[PDB]
Amino acid sequence: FMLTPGNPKWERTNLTYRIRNYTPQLSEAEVERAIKDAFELWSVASPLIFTRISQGEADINIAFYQRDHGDNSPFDGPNGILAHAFQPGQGIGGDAHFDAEETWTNTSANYNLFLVAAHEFGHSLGLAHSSDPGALMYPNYAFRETSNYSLPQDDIDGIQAIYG
Length: 164
Ligand SMILES: CC(C)C[C@@H](C(=O)N[C@H]1CCCCCCCCCCNC1=O)[C@H](O)C(=O)NO
Ligand SMILES: [Ca+2]
Ligand SMILES: [Ca+2]
Ligand SMILES: [Zn+2]
Ligand SMILES: [Zn+2]
Fold this sequence. Notes:
Binding site for Ca(2+) 2: 76-77, 79, 81, 99, 102
Protein name: Neutrophil collagenase
Binding site for Ca(2+) 1: 59, 91, 93, 95
Binding site for Zn(2+) 1: 69, 71, 84, 97
Number of strands: 5
CATH architecture: 3-Layer(aba) Sandwich
CATH topology: Collagenase (Catalytic Domain)
Binding site for Zn(2+) 2: 119, 123, 129
Bound molecules: a molecule of 2 linked components (HLE-RIN), calcium ion, zinc ion
């Protein structure tokens, strides 16, 4: 596992998140469920607790954007890069952005939103990419059975390293 350079981290263990917009590919409930499950993966392996808020400023903003959206990391249309997130900090810090031009799913078809969101939240918490191909923080998307999916050991060692 690899920690984000400078070892950024949240000082508080109770964090909020807000879904600013949705993709037309899934129902709002389906998007909400995928995001919640993604956060819960991290909760089982750390002392962090995440709460959804419907108005106000959340620690982690979740949004669907396309091409150039003003943050210096433009998306690239279908395929290529799927999403990106920012290290712990105020404002844009901790936020997660998903490429609106992808076909998002909750199945084995590309690109399962749950698995992508799970990976992004690792960044939101201070983790960098892993060189273990079996790790969630590995830099390439790969479908894994989602029903009883839990965090691989490398990812556990990583968040424990920061918050344990
Ligand atoms: C791990 C994934 C959920 C996010 C990263 C990502 O989008 N990786 C892509 C790398 C491959 C690009 C080369 C094209 C190959 C076609 C595959 C399409 C799916 N894309 C990827 O797997 C993202 O870079 C990231 O690390 N964000 O935190
Ligand atoms: Ca893309
Ligand atoms: Ca933020
Ligand atoms: Zn962005
Ligand atoms: Zn990544």
